[PDB]
Each structure stands twice: as structure tokens, then as C-alpha cells.
Design an enzyme around this catalytic site. Structure first.
Site, mmCIF file in Angstrom:
data_model
loop_
_atom_site.group_PDB
_atom_site.id
_atom_site.type_symbol
_atom_site.label_atom_id
_atom_site.label_comp_id
_atom_site.label_asym_id
_atom_site.label_seq_id
_atom_site.Cartn_x
_atom_site.Cartn_y
_atom_site.Cartn_z
ATOM 1 N N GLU A 41 5.761 2.160 -9.404
ATOM 2 C CA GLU A 41 5.332 3.340 -8.682
ATOM 3 C C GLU A 41 6.120 4.492 -9.302
ATOM 4 O O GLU A 41 7.257 4.772 -8.902
ATOM 5 C CB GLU A 41 5.664 3.268 -7.187
ATOM 6 C CG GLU A 41 5.273 4.573 -6.477
ATOM 7 C CD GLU A 41 6.019 4.837 -5.183
ATOM 8 O OE1 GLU A 41 7.095 4.231 -4.946
ATOM 9 O OE2 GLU A 41 5.523 5.681 -4.401
ATOM 10 N N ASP B 223 9.064 -0.388 -6.458
ATOM 11 C CA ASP B 223 9.105 0.751 -5.551
ATOM 12 C C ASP B 223 9.944 1.913 -6.092
ATOM 13 O O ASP B 223 10.993 1.703 -6.700
ATOM 14 C CB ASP B 223 9.678 0.296 -4.202
ATOM 15 C CG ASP B 223 9.816 1.437 -3.202
ATOM 16 O OD1 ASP B 223 8.770 1.931 -2.723
ATOM 17 O OD2 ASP B 223 10.970 1.840 -2.902
ATOM 18 N N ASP C 276 1.149 4.853 1.354
ATOM 19 C CA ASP C 276 1.724 6.207 1.391
ATOM 20 C C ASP C 276 0.671 7.313 1.471
ATOM 21 O O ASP C 276 0.736 8.176 2.346
ATOM 22 C CB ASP C 276 2.580 6.493 0.152
ATOM 23 C CG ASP C 276 3.819 5.632 0.076
ATOM 24 O OD1 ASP C 276 4.474 5.438 1.123
ATOM 25 O OD2 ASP C 276 4.145 5.169 -1.038
HETATM 26 CA CA LIG Z 1 8.681 6.192 -0.887
#
Ligand SMILES: [Ca+2]
Ligand SMILES: CO[C@@H]1O[C@H](CO)[C@@H](S[C@H]2O[C@H](CO)[C@@H](S[C@H]3O[C@H](CO)[C@@H](S[C@@H]4O[C@H](CO)[C@@H](O)[C@H](O)[C@H]4O)[C@H](O)[C@H]3O)[C@H](O)[C@H]2O)[C@H](O)[C@H]1O
Ligand SMILES: OC[C@H]1O[C@H](S[C@H]2[C@H](O)[C@@H](O)[C@H](O)O[C@@H]2CO)[C@H](O)[C@@H](O)[C@@H]1O
Ligand SMILES: OC[C@H]1O[C@H](S[C@H]2[C@H](O)[C@@H](O)[C@H](O)O[C@@H]2CO)[C@H](O)[C@@H](O)[C@@H]1O
Ligand SMILES: [Ca+2]
Ligand SMILES: [Ca+2]
Ligand SMILES: [Ca+2]
Length: 404
Positions: free
Chosen positions: A205, A180, A291
Site C-alpha cells: 500500500e 500496510d 479505507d
Molecule cells: Ca492507514
């Protein structure tokens, strides 16, 4: 053969009876669809319900998704079907359970009886002055404003986080990681954790903004954007490393390309324009995630063209990642399964060869490993470009796939 599947969305924590428990009833479909890896949400106690503000890392029972027992059941079930489990690792930042003598929440609790992860402000990047005590190293990456950013240069932090990571594998059964907000720290720090916990894969990410023109649309030339990603992989260890990246370059371009501008789907060299075109083995492609899509919708894929997005990533090199919603709630379950079956049956992998046959505004036609031809776009007839011997295998709204 490798196909990822994000097993949750932004609303998953709200699931009645527990998300993991509900997911037990989804395992079989996911496996039969040819999925090899299922990405699950941050498993630890988190100040925020979705889990992206972890506190007591070992406190799995406090998760809104379900407790350790339920999670182990889900992972066990996936493993029973030959499917691996990817854990969403959130370590850029961390919330501290208790206050220090300054009245600042910077006294951390790992979730066990001993001092594991029981850090203090000395573990908080000194430049994060809202929480730090000024004694740590400077952040190695970007900051997360709503919580203490962790000093990964700190020896104890590296040691304990790695121990925790290994625990997620040995005690819960996790096989790999999803890193993350990897821009929160350097690829060098990511290297420490990746190399130190030997996950089957570690998809990061790394989300950088995509350059756009005066009209708000992404530029045709996105090399600067995918170069950053290639560089990140090189710095984390390259081919030898288990590390890889979400293909945001392909995501941004494809978002625009399907709106009748499919000419965007090829670079001047004749290769895919995203990371897929430069380092396919390290490119995890996707149509949307929690997201960009779901209820956050930070960058949604044109909703009426989603299946074109899947016809694209599921037949192309790079490692495609299916989004939960699309598979179970949008009604594309069967079409997505059929597309994976085609990929698998033809032995298509992340490194398969891509030969683009047409790249016009309303028509993109490509041939993979000389065995699969795919087309997307509103133009109905592209028969003149379909190689001899190919016969339609699957089709839908503005997409079709041929096999030979
Ligand atoms: Ca975020
Ligand atoms: C109404 O809803 C529509 O449903 C449509 C079907 O799913 C799609 S079109 C979609 O899939 C199409 C294939 O079924 C291709 S056309 C594509 O493939 C064709 C078959 O190989 C060839 S050749 C075909 O031969 C027929 C018999 O000779 C002839 O009658 C047809 O006219 C001819 O197409 C064709 O040349 C080739 O282009 C589309 O490109 C895909 O988009 C709609 O999107 C959906 O809205
Ligand atoms: O193919 C794996 C290869 O990927 C890159 S080299 C890459 C370069 O970053 C890009 O600017 C140029 O246009 O294409 C080449 C080839 O795809 C990485 O740097 C390297 O370690 C790796 O072997
Ligand atoms: O909402 C506009 C959009 O609606 C559907 S796509 C999709 C919808 O976004 C999603 O919330 C729901 O779970 O599934 C549907 C598809 O089953 C419609 O198909 C599309 O044309 C429209 O633009
Ligand atoms: Ca403790
Ligand atoms: Ca912070
Ligand atoms: Ca940081």
C-alpha cells in the site's frame, strides 16, 4: 489467472460470533467466483480493534477477528478450494504493551514466553521522540503519529520480524503479504522482508496524494503519480521480486473518469493511464478498499457506478482485487462472478494486451487480447466500434462485455 479479493471491511471486527467464523460460510462463493487470493485483516493483537495498531504479534488469539484456531480453519478452507491467503502485514509501527522507567509505553511484548519481539525503545526510530530513547536509526519512511514507528534498519528487528512472518506461513498457513502503510518505510526495507520470506506475492500500500487542478479534480496527466509507484517496485527488486503495488493511480483516475469523463482512461501513448499502463504485472487494481470505501469512505467510488468499475478492472490487465462489500452486500455477486468467468475463460491475465477503441466522455470501449471487448459509460450505442464477430456476453448498468 489471478484475481484478488479483500475478505473484510472496516466493520468486520464487530461480526457476531467472529469474522473468520462467518467467512467460512463465504469461502465457496469466493472460490466459485474465480478468486485466487483472499486478503485477510491484521491477525495479531492490536490496541485498535481493526488491528492496525499491532502489539503482541504472535498473540493471534487476542484478535477481534477470531483466534488462531478459527483463522487456521478459514485459511484451511480457502486452501481446500485452491485459494491462497494474503495476510495484512502491519510493521511500520507497533504498540508497546508495557512502560519503561520513563513511564513511556516502549517495552514491547511479542506474545511468546521468550524474548521474541520483546523490544525496547532502542527499536523505535529515534526521530519519533514521543517514544524513542534517541539510540536508534532515523525512520526510513513516513511516521504514524499514534504509535511507535519501528527502526527497520535495526538488525534484531529485521531478524525477528522475518521469523514472525515465516511463522505466519508455517503455523497459520498464509501464502502472501499485503504491506500496510508501505510509505512508512523505504522500499529497501520492504525488500528485506519480501526477499526474506518468499511470499507468493507482496502487494504494497504505497499511497501518494494525487495531483489535482483548481477544480479539485485529478489532473488528466498522472504520470508523476504512477512513476512513483513504478520506482518503488524497481527499488524493491523489480520483476524478480514478489513485490507489487495497489494501483492507486488507476483508482483516483477511475473515480473521476466514470462521472462522464471517460476520456481520462487513456494516456497520450494509447495505454491505460494508471500503473496498469506501465507495469501491469505489478499493478493490483481495485474499485474500493476498507479505507477509501466501507465506513471510512476516504475516497469512495461513485456508488451508482461501481459495476462500471468492475467491468473495467475485471476485464483489463493488472491484477484486479474485488472488495467484500461489493460482492456480498451490494448485490453484485453474480455479475462480478460472470465478469471473472469471462476473464478466466479467455485466459486474460495481468499482462494481457489492451487496445482502446473509444475514449469519449460518456463512452469507453476497449479490447483485451483480441478476445474480449468491454464498454462502460452512459452512452447506449457504441455498436459501430464493436469489432466484427463479437457478441454480448454480459451487461448491466452502463456497461457491457462482448466475447468472440
Ligand atoms: Ca492507514
Ligand atoms: C434499463 O436498464 C438498462 O439495462 C441495459 C441492458 O443491460 C443497460 S445498456 C448496457 O448493455 C447494452 C447491451 O445489452 C449496451 S448496448 C450495446 O450492445 C448491443 C447488443 O450487442 C448493441 S446492438 C443491439 O441490437 C439490438 C437488436 O438489433 C437493438 O435492438 C439494440 O438497440 C442494439 O443495442 C449496441 O449497439 C451496443 O451499444 C449498453 O451500451 C450497455 O450500457 C443500461 O445501462 C441499463 O440502465
Ligand atoms: O514494463 C516494465 C518496466 O516498467 C518500468 S519502465 C517504464 C517507465 O517507468 C515509464 O516512465 C515509461 O513511460 O514507460 C516505461 C515502460 O512501461 C520499470 O522502470 C522497468 O524496470 C520495467 O522493466
Ligand atoms: O447510498 C447511496 C447509493 O445507494 C445505493 S448503492 C449501495 C449502498 O451505497 C450500500 O450502502 C449498500 O450496501 O448497497 C447499495 C446497493 O445495493 C444505490 O444503488 C445508489 O444509486 C445510491 O447512490
Ligand atoms: Ca515475550
Ligand atoms: Ca510514530
Ligand atoms: Ca516509519
Amino acid at each position: 489467472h489471478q484475481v484478488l479479493f479483500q475478505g473484510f471491511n472496516w466493520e468486520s471486527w464487530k461480526q457476531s460470533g467472529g469474522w473468520y467464523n462467518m467467512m467460512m460460510g463465504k469461502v465457496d462463493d469466493i472460490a466459485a467466483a474465480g478468486v485466487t487470493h483472499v486478503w485477510l485483516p491484521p491477525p495479531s493483537h492490536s490496541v485498535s480493534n481493526e488491528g492496525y495498531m499491532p502489539g503482541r504479534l504472535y498473540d493471534i488469539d487476542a484478535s477481534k477477528y477470531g483466534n488462531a484456531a478459527e483463522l487456521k480453519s478459514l485459511i484451511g478452507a480457502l486452501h481446500g478450494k485452491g485459494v491462497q491467503a494474503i495476510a495484512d502485514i502491519v510493521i511500520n509501527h507497533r504498540c508497546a504493551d508495557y512502560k519503561d522507567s520513563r513511564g513511556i509505553y516502549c517495552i514491547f511484548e511479542g506474545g511468546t514466553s521468550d524474548g521474541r519481539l520483546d523490544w525496547g525503545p532502542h527499536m523505535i526510530c529515534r526521530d519519533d521522540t514521543k517514544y524513542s530513547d534517541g539510540t536508534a536509526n532515523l525512520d526510513t519512511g513516513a511516521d504514524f503519529a499514534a504509535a511507535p514507528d519501528i527502526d527497520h534498519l535495526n538488525d534484531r528487528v529485521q531478524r525477528e520480524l522475518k521469523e514472525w512472518l515465516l511463522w505466519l506461513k508455517s503455523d497459520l498457513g498464509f501464502d502472501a503479504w499485503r504491506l500496510d502503510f508501505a510509505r512508512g518505510y523505504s522500499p529497501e526495507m520492504a525488500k528485506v522482508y519480501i526477499d526474506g520470506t518468499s511470499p507468493s506475492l507482496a502487494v504494497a500500500e504505497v499511497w501518494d496524494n494525487m495531483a489535482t487542478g483548481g477544480d479539485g479534480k485529478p489532473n488528466y496527466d498522472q504520470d508523476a503519480h504512477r512513476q512513483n509507484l513504478v520506482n518503488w517496485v524497481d527499488k524493491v527488486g523489480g520483476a524478480a521480486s514478489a513485490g507489487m503495488v495497489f494501483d492507486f493511480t488507476t483508482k483516483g483516475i477511475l473515480n473521476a473518469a466514470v462521472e462522464g469523463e471517460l476520456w481520462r482512461l487513456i494516456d497520450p501513448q494509447g495505454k491505460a493511464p494508471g500503473v496498469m499502463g506501465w507495469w501491469p504485472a505489478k499493478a493490483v487494481t481495485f474499485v474500493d478498499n476498507h479505507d477509501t470505501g466501507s465506513t471510512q469512505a476516504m475516497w469512495p467510488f461513485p456508488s451508482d457506478k461501481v459495476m462500471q468499475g468492475y467491468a473495467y478492472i475485471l476485464t483489463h490487465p493488472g491484477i484486479p482485487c474485488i472488495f467484500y462489500d461489493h460482492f456480498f452486500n451490494w448485490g453484485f455477486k453474480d455479475q462480478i462472478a460472470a465478469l471473472v468467468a469471462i476473464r478466466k475463460r479467455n485466459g486474460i491475465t495481468a499482462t494481457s494486451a489492451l487496445k482502446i477503441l473509444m475514449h469519449e466522455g460518456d463512452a469507453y470501449v476497449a479490447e483485451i487480447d483480441g478476445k474480449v471487448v468491454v464498454k462502460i459509460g452512459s452512452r447506449y450505442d457504441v455498436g459501430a466500434v464493436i469489432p466484427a464477430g463479437f457478441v454480448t456476453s454480459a451487461h448491466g448498468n452502463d456497461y457491457a462485455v462482448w466475447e468472440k
